[model samples]
Target: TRPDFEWLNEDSRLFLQRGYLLEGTTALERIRFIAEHAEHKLGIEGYADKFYHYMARGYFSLSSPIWSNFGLDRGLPISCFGSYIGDSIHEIMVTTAEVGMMSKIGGGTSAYFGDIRPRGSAIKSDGSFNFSKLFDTVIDVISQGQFAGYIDIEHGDIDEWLDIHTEGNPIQLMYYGVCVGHDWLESMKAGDPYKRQLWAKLLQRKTETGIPYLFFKDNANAGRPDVYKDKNMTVHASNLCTEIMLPSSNDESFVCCLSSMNLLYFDEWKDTEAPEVLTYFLDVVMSEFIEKSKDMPFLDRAHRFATRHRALGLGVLGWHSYLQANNIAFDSFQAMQKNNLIFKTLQEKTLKASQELAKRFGEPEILKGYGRRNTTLMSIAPTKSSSFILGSVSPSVEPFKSNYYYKNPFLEKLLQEKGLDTEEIWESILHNDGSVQHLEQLTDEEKEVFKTFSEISQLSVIQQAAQRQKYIDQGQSINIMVHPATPARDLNQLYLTAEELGLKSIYYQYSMSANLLSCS
Candidate 1:
């Protein structure tokens, strides 16, 4: 087996060593084992060779949990599991125990507190709620994964929760947020004081800490005209990174397993067999996840959603790099055109792949029009680890920050050809707060292509996101960029525009003012 050290950087090699490597197994050896395991699951001709070929070439990647646990005997391939806390002392603590148990073995844990009786509505007990504190303690006890807890936007204690750790450090590691919906957006637009106050608080807190993400309920539940859901069945919360949004109940939890294709190879993707291979692996991972969850120690409210939805996230990375390569300005109409076609192609291929797999294996009888292996075929997740492992491509569909850290080797080669590759241009790249627009030597066309996230128009960003949201069955982890000087009023306008365009969710408010300065 090839060491492949030339491609796998020192950091990536060490990370694999820590998490995925057996005591004596090499990187190539481990991957071969994984590929063989997947091939056996399908028993397809030459599938193992195709799986290992793209993986070693860095064209595609499976989810981290697969690399960590798929081959083990006692180990189950479950990655992310989320549940809602029931409204009683017994049920609440029971879910808490499940949280600790899931954390012990691969927990991307999320819980919803919207169902809990609002503070001051307690019938027999008259004490302030400490659910966040208790859950935070449980997650911290294991300290292996990220935790997210969501409440309703109309929750009575939202203001208190937003300001919970502002002055003093009370919250340890849990990320908290309220679920906003179309009904509340209408209320605020028509002049409701309570809704208005909450909007202001959301903007202000987001600008401050970047926690407390806003999940738009109606957009998430109703965005896909193709996939219809009853008003009674709605999505309430999301996982830590806010990618996969599936409906869950007190008696059931959704299990998520995902993999992503590297968009740096966009040109090579359509012509290759890579899409089918990636989809097959995702289908197998969920199949294993469902069976394994049946007897996972403390999980009664787990794995039912998997059987129902058969959800698999087929995401992409190097998005900004793909744009930069084609010299397309991010805020332009051309970028939205590019976004539409790319996601359209992705959805078409993966859904078709899932359909073929269903014929081989079987789909749920309750499935809609077509018989597909998975209910939701795609989710745009922020693939930080996978991106880094594959060579620091841009994470998910989010834009880059500073041109300095973008590592656009393809762009660098062109810069050398144009002789604009001098030390002065390079210095400005570092000093200009991650923007290349300040470089006098570069053409406006070049600058437009390389503009950082903070430099692009926020409204246009929303517009492009809206274009892709229609094509996706699940949500995308998108960031809204803002400067520290940006007022709450301007932020309000952006939110108004997002709702007007039908966005499902707005992730971290990346305030760029901290690094504000001139480079040249």
Candidate 2:
């Protein structure tokens, strides 16, 4: 029997209907089709029962592509793909075409341009120089379908790339990132004129465009698990959403299947339900992909890498909502400890599940040395669209954007049913620009627990991310909220602290003013 979906908001219902539930005649039929297909294809007996139960209850969700493509012929279930780019024009063109192919099938692409020569470098015998303008143009044109393209600039030309965004020449359809290492930080601290100029320019670009996100290469590689650490592989870039970090090269392009647990839905007793289900689901999905890769000619490289490494990102959403419901302040020690416990639980369970899968289905080829199923597991992804679809839970591990903005409608309904004056509390939240701090109707405890991103201290945010990073095998997509008046030195200090704490990546530095929405 299909469960009632009345808990979902109108927007969420519409999104699911159009994207996932439309093909089947009814919601029950849709769920059955997905579950049954997964079980049959993966040869997992009674898999449908568990899958249907968890999905119906909203305990977990696969990435957007999986919902739409998993049962269909010619479907590609992986949500993220990372490709490597070389200096040659042919290599660039091939990767460009590959990006289009991946996007057309509802998969996002991340391209590493570290091997490409810097902006002014000579191009063979032709007296031409290398620049991303042409490649950026191609990406903009090709990436209009169902996915996004992220380009990572090599360390040598990061300054030049930042100038493009800062000068208002940002690419239309491509997200940008810069790889930063310990050397970069040391230079910044030493106040090297060239590095200083680049730092200022990077921040200036961020202030203008909110992008070319920072990928901390030193921290990511240094803190990688024993498997990758032993291989001495260098992580070049992250996927489109700034999660899913891994090593890639011209010969091998890595791909990752992603799913996130809805933390708020987990009751006190079964906090591990979502992570446990997702772990088995991803293991099956990876096995399916490895088998299918042999027949798909275009996906040879991606298939080879997946069969060998078997990477997956089991993440979480509804962080802020969880804290609010539990009356834990976002910046409090309790919050940090809670995050640590949550991630630690996820990591431990996921690794154990992977090991169990390896025992049943044999380890991935590359893992033969270590006798494991997957090389990497667990990432904290940005849940912007997925969160909305899942009843508007807070995105990923981020705090609430504002007390009022994007509040889950289901949560609002629950509050109203509890006899609270929803309208009065909402009005106060709006008057305070999405803050509940000044609401007289709420107790002091509520105010502290419901603090928004802009209200939290920078150090507290970093501390929370650092705590979570310890358990995450990949990275967390953390957005550090900043105001216009925030001093450069403070920002630097935050970066230094993050580096010191071994954070793999800091996703975005968002401006508070631009984020403010009019209550009226």
Tell me how far the alpha carbon of residue 398 in candidate 2 is from the true structure, in angstroms, after superposition.
0.7
lDDT of each: 0.75, 0.71
What are the per-residue Cα lDDT tens digits for candidate 2 across 80-142? Answer: 788787668777776766676676565777777777765556643221113355555655566
lDDT tens digits by residue: candidate 1, 272-294: 87878898988888777777777
Q: Model 1: what TM-score?
A: 0.92
Q: lDDT of candidate 2?
A: 0.71
Report per-prediction Cα RMSD to one decimal. Answer: 3.5, 4.1
Model 2 residue runs over 4 Å out of place are 1-10, 21-25, 120-131, 143-156, 166-170, 268-274, 291-297, 406-425, 514-520
Considering only N, C-alpha and C atoms within 3 Å, which residue pairs clash in candidate 1? 402-434, 431-519
> Candidate 2: minimum summed lDDT over ten consecutive residues — where?
123-132
Q: After superposition, how far is residue 454 of candidate 1 from its true place, in Å?
A: 1.6
Backbone clash tally for model 1?
Answer: 2
